[PDB]
Amino acid sequence: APEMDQFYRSTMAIYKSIMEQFNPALENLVYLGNNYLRAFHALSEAAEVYFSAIQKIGEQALQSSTSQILGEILVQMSDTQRHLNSDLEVVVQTFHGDLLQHMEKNTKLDMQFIKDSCQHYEIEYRHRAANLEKCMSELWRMERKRDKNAREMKESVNRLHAQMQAFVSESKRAAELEEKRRYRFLAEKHLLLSNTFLQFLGRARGMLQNRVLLWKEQS
Amino acid sequence: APEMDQFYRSTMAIYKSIMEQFNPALENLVYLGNNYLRAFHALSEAAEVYFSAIQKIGEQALQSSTSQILGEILVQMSDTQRHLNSDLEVVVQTFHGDLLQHMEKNTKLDMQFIKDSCQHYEIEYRHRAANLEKCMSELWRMERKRDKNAREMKESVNRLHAQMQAFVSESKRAAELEEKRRYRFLAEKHLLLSNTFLQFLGRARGMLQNRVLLWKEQS
């Protein structure tokens, strides 16, 4: 009995961690996440305006009489930045489409899921608890009543308590699992982001290893 | 002779362009430079806040019964973003310090230099043009007086006209050299920025590709 309100409490602490700790944190990450995107979109703009202006300076040098080659270099620096940005707004779109639209689209759908799960558990615990402790009393009083049929009632109670041990034990494991599944999903989505961004790193590094060589002006 | 005039107007057109076109383009470039810097430090701040939250979640998983490994990963993911941001803000300060600040002064000290080079050329052109007229005048006078020595005056005028052709060619090649030095500065600075950013791309790849393999196996 004492050990069982323990399971009950421990299982409840987990559903409550999910509902009022984890779930809200996902709304938050969608909030902070959207701010993150807007900063990204602002950086890419400031870059495009900056390099568009380098392109113009470059276009002037192309027109000149001795700075044609320097002219070519500046124009292809802006072109490069334009490319790296195309590459980067891919990672930014993975972040948006694959991660940020996912959480806001499902966050309440999964709140309600765990809410029903938690309710199902509580309600079944209450019943077993009730049907059990009442059977104990039947046994408890057809006990002093020196009833012969107290033996079928002793086994009816003992199996009822075994089933509750099973259920309570299984619920705690299933609730732990759900918690882990949600951490794992957060970790996995961020692993995909880390991976796309790693890919961008290799591409950008790819073109800069040669650009830096082509833009030297001698030796 | 007015083809020497056409040299004169081009040699001035070059100095005046550096001063009236190029340098106000660089001042604009400094502004867009700092706007760019501004959007980066904001992205940094957004990303920083976002992954500070990711890490909190990791710290909550670190205190669960079965999600400690996933929680360690999430925290390792924040620590990684933080390291990368730190490493990149370093490249960004190269931008501000090695480029933007240096342009600032160049676009200030330069205007005085170009003013002094225009004036200097104007003074030297006119002194040579005046002395040429003065010798042509002395020639035509001898030619009136039937002076036998106009033979050694026309010879001199020829020498002077020649030295004037040389001065007019040199001064223009010197103007074109000045205009090109300034494009060269723009290009050298951004090549340096490019190499600094390339070194970072390597460091970022190196650190991230290792983490991603681990995270993949652990989750």
Q: What is the CATH number of the domain that holds B96?
A: 1.20.1270.60
Tokens 């005085």 sit on residue: B112
The answer to whether the Cβ–Cβ distance between B46 and A29 falls below 8 Å is no
What's the structural domain count of chain A? 1
Tokens 């909550």 sit on residue: B60
Task: Residue window 184-213, chain B: list those with CB within 8 Å of chain A.
Answer: 184, 186-187, 190-191, 194-195, 197-198, 201-202, 204-205, 208-209, 211-212
**SS3 label, residue B152:** helix
Phi, psi of B63 (to 5 degrees): -110, 15
The answer to whether the Cβ–Cβ distance between B46 and A64 falls below 8 Å is no
Compute the distance between CA of residue A124 and CA of residue A111 in angstroms, rounded to an integer.
20
Partner A contacted by B21 (CB < 8 A): yes
Residues ≥6 apart with Cβ < 8 Å to A74:
A54, A55, A57, A58, A61, B183, B186, B187, B190
Q: Which of A94, A91, A128, A115 is nearest to A8 (CA)?
A: A128
- Domain range for residue B68? 1-219
Measure CB to CB from residue B194 to each of A39, A49, A212 and give the nearest one. A212
Compute the distance between CA of residue B203 and CA of residue B134 in angstroms, rounded to an integer.
70
The DSSP secondary structure of A34-103, one letter per residue, reads: HHHHHHHHHHHHHHHHHHHHHHHHHHHHHHSSS-HHHHHHHHHHHHHHHHHHHHHHHHHHHIIIIIIHHH
The answer to whether the Cβ–Cβ distance between B43 and A45 falls below 8 Å is no
Closest A-chain CA to B40? A43
Partner B contacted by A49 (CB < 8 A): yes
The answer to whether the Cβ–Cβ distance between B36 and A43 falls below 8 Å is yes
Q: How was this structure determined?
A: X-ray
Measure CB to CB from residue B187 to each of A40, A45, A74 and give the nearest one. A74
Q: Pinpoint the alpha helices (H) of B62-150.
A: 68-94, 101-145
What is the sign, positive or negative, of the torsion defined by CA atoms of B18, B20, B21, B26? Answer: positive
Q: What is the resolution of this structure in A?
A: 2.2
The answer to whether the Cβ–Cβ distance between A57 and B194 falls below 8 Å is no
The answer to whether the Cβ–Cβ distance between B42 and A45 falls below 8 Å is no
Q: Please give the single-letter amino acid code of residue A177.
A: L
Q: How many angstroms separate the CA of residue A66 from the nearest CA in chain B?
A: 7
